[PDB]
Design a protein around this ligand. Structure first.
Ligand SMILES: Nc1ccn([C@H]2C[C@H](O)[C@@H](COP(=O)(O)NP(=O)(O)OP(=O)(O)O)O2)c(=O)n1
Ligand SMILES: [Mg+2]
Ligand SMILES: [Mg+2]
Length: 430
DNA sequence: ATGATGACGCT
DNA sequence: AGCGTCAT
């Protein structure tokens, strides 16, 4: 009882932009606003590959990874914006710059952890402490939570969505203990007030809408965020966890969407996260390892300790291109020309990064894929990154990979290359 | 023939 | 170091 920790020590939010690359293109081009529309890369192969989809287009069944020619069969009026192409490859600069707009606004509120191009975790524990003291001891109005859902409410003894949202919010607020500055539910509620402010600032200052989750840890905040996307935020309290997890497929929890989650399901013969509570910690560690077993034992009870790391900037800067099917690179000079294209984009990004962020990368990682292999990378080699010079980086990358060539000729490359990747890593202050 | 990314764990 | 998992 008195000594069982409940994982309620922190307030953590996750903010995730709604259909992010689409909103970037819709801000730029008002003709795309409030329309079914998608962002595509490489127009020549089947209209291009879809990498982002507006909610109007999702209603027709358009998804990521669809070819645009195929998406047009579901949604004949679908509008498209194409990713910029530079040096024969997709160039994601516009979306990285738009990401920086959002991450700089979030950082005014709390130190962030950049988790992807369009999301960040926030540890609001300290901001909440300070807002609680400024708040005297006065009630939190529903008006301060105009886009907040309380997961699991309403419950107990309306037929539209907004009606239900408010009924649940009313039940929550009506039962809150405001005189107790250490109540975790009160802390989450104040965290949600702050996230409303944060989301209003992002939309005001950028034009972009987003969703968010507010809970006691990263996994629950991430799960919470997706429950009422788009343009809404969701509070998942500790008390909401048993019911929420009772029908929650294991693969929906972050880090369990792959082979480990499949093995949890297969080895234990279960489907839902809540069902994990019936195993001892030792039993879970016996199947999945010490670290995973302890993580699962705590996570299925809503408890997780992974900190919000103070990191706003990516740790690596990389440039990648595939060469699928018949386009696989088969000669030495093809290989050199494309390494050079990659290296030129990398230099551009590295130089900008050194001026903006006062650091330099010191290691260059070169990765390739061979036709016939199975995996994301076939082979990775590093060397020193001592100069931001594209001809030197590309010459160096060739040097460290040039013996992967099984060909007995000089001018040919075998087995042909289906992917090249350059990645700058190991940053030092500058 | 989705692709272009990016963090982090195991060894 | 170099490989693999998981993720957007
Ligand atoms: N596999 C993926 C997933 C996302 N992305 C890019 C495009 C997306 O707009 C952006 C953010 O990914 P996301 O958060 O998973 N989805 P998106 O923001 O488009 O829509 P929501 O479902 O979050 O509203 O990363 C990508 O290029 N490849
Ligand atoms: Mg998003
Ligand atoms: Mg995201």
């Amino acid at each position: 009882g008195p000594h069982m920790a409940t994982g309620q020590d922190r307030v953590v939010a996750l903010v995730d932009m709604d259909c992010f690359f689409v909103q970037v293109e819709q801000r730029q081009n008002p003709h795309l606003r409030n329309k079914p529309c998608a962002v595509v890369q490489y127009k020549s192969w089947k209209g291009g590959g879809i990498i982002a989809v507006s909610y109007e287009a999702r209603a027709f069944g358009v998804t990521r990874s669809m070819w645009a020619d195929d998406a047009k069969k579901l949604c004949p009026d679908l509008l498209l914006a194409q990713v910029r192409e530079s040096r024969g490859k997709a160039n994601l600069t516009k979306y990285r710059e738009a990401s920086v707009e959002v991450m700089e606004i979030m950082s005014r509120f709390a130190v962030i952890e950049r988790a992807s191009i369009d999301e960040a975790y926030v540890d609001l524990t300290s901001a909440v402490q300070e807002r609680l003291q400024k708040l005297q001891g006065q009630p939190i109005s529903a008006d301060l939570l105009p886009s907040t859902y309380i997961e699991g409410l309403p419950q107990g003894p309306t037929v539209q969505k907004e009606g239900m949202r408010k009924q649940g919010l009313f039940q929550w607020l009506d039962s809150l203990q405001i005189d107790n500055l250490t109540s975790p539910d009160l802390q989450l509620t104040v965290g949600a007030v702050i996230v409303e402010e944060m989301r209003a600032a992002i939309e005001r200052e950028t034009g972009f809408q987003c969703s968010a989750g507010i809970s006691h840890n990263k996994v629950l905040a991430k799960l919470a965020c997706g429950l009422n996307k788009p343009n809404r935020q969701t509070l998942v309290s500790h008390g909401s966890v048993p019911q929420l997890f009772s029908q929650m497929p294991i693969r929906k929890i972050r880090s369990l969407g792959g082979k480990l989650g499949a093995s949890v399901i297969e080895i234990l013969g279960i489907e839902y996260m809540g069902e994990l509570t019936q195993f001892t910690e030792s039993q879970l560690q016996s199947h999945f390892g010490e670290k995973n077993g302890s993580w699962l034992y705590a996570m299925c009870r809503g408890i997780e300790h992974d900190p919000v790391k103070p990191r706003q900037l990516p740790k690596t800067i990389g440039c990648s291109k595939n060469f699928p099917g018949k386009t696989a690179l088969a000669t030495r000079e093809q290989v050199q020309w494309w390494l050079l294209q990659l290296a030129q984009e990398l230099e551009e990004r590295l130089t900008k990064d050194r001026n903006d962020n006062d650091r330099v990368a010191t290691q260059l990682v070169v990765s390739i894929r061979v036709q016939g292999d199975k995996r994301l990378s076939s082979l990775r080699r590093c060397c020193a990154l001592t100069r931001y010079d594209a001809h030197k980086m590309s010459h160096d990358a060739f040097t460290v990979i040039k013996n992967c060539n099984t060909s007995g000729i000089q001018t040919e490359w075998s087995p042909p290359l289906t992917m090249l990747f350059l990645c700058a890593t190991k940053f030092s202050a500058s």
